[PDB]
Amino acid sequence: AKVETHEFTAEISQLMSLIINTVYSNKEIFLRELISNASDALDKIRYQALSDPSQLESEPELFIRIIPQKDQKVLEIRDSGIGMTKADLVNNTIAKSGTKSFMEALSAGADVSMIGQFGVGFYSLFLVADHVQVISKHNDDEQYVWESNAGGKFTVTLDETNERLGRGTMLRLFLKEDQLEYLEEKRIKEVVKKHSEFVAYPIQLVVTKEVE
Numbered sequence: 001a002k003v004e005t006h007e008f009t010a011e012i013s014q015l016m017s018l019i020i021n022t023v024y025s026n027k028e029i030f031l032r033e034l035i036s037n038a039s040d041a042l043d044k045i046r047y048q049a050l051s052d053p054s055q056l057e058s059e060p061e062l063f064i065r066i067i068p069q070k071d072q073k074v075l076e077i078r079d080s081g082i083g084m085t086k087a088d089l090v091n092n093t094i095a096k097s098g099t100k101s102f103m104e105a106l107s108a109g110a111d112v113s114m115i116g117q118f119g120v121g122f123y124s125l126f127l128v129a130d131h132v133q134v135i136s137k138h139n140d141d142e143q144y145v146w147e148s149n150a151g152g153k154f155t156v157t158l159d160e161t162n163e164r165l166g167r168g169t170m171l172r173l174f175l176k177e178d179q180l181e182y183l184e185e186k187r188i189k190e191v192v193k194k195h196s197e198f199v200a201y202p203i204q205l206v207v208t209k210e211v212e
């Protein structure tokens with residue numbers, strides 16, 4: 001499998017470093033942000049399906065799914081949205097403008113929670129995670145895995161190790177030891193009900209209970 005390496009733009013590498021290092025208190029906002037991206041990605045596939053309902057056939061169910069993996073200290077956020085082609089992942093760039101604007105607003109004293117308003121709320125995941133894999137499948141393209149440690153370099157490899165998505169995106173968040181509360185059914189239920197009431201799509205939570 002060929003791991004293509006790429007370097008992050010200097011503004012993107014500095015944004016990633018700011019968030020991963022910050023002390024922000026309301027770190028739970030990351031979930032609103034990722035859910036909001038997943039909901040938007042679903043809106044995008046649903047729009048195409050208004051024209052062409054064959055676009056939905058790669059994964060007919062439209063959903064956001066939250067999958068804690070206590071064994072691996074991993075929280076996965078999966079959507080069956082539009083997904084991202086390999087070219088998308090290697091060049092993901094409205095980010096450039098929103099990264100600069102958001103950085104200016106932070107100087108003026110904006111709170112970290114305003115990140116979504118500048119369109120770069122994906123990077124809020126580094127509040128609770130030190131490393132991240134992003135697995136994506138766009139309809140007319142193959143399934144790839146993007147990877148970043150918040151440094152200045154990310155990889156994009158063909159996906160030969162993860163479950164097939166059918167269509168969409170799954171973020172594998174490698175949580176920090178301080179933020180392992182977000183693997184908890186009850187803690188995750190709190191954050192979702194608080195900040196994502198108005199989501200057109202089912203937010204499914206996967207829970208592994210032992211049969212007694």
Ligand SMILES: COc1cccc(-c2cc(F)ccc2[C@H]2Cc3nc(N)nc(C)c3C(=O)N2)n1
Nearest residue numbers: 037038041079083084092095119120122134169
């Ligand atoms: C989701 O995985 C990745 C990987 C690198 C960069 C981005 C990203 C970055 C932004 F700054 C702003 C927006 C994005 C993503 C956010 C996103 N999330 C999800 N769940 N699905 C899609 C299609 C996108 C999308 O279209 N663009 N997302």
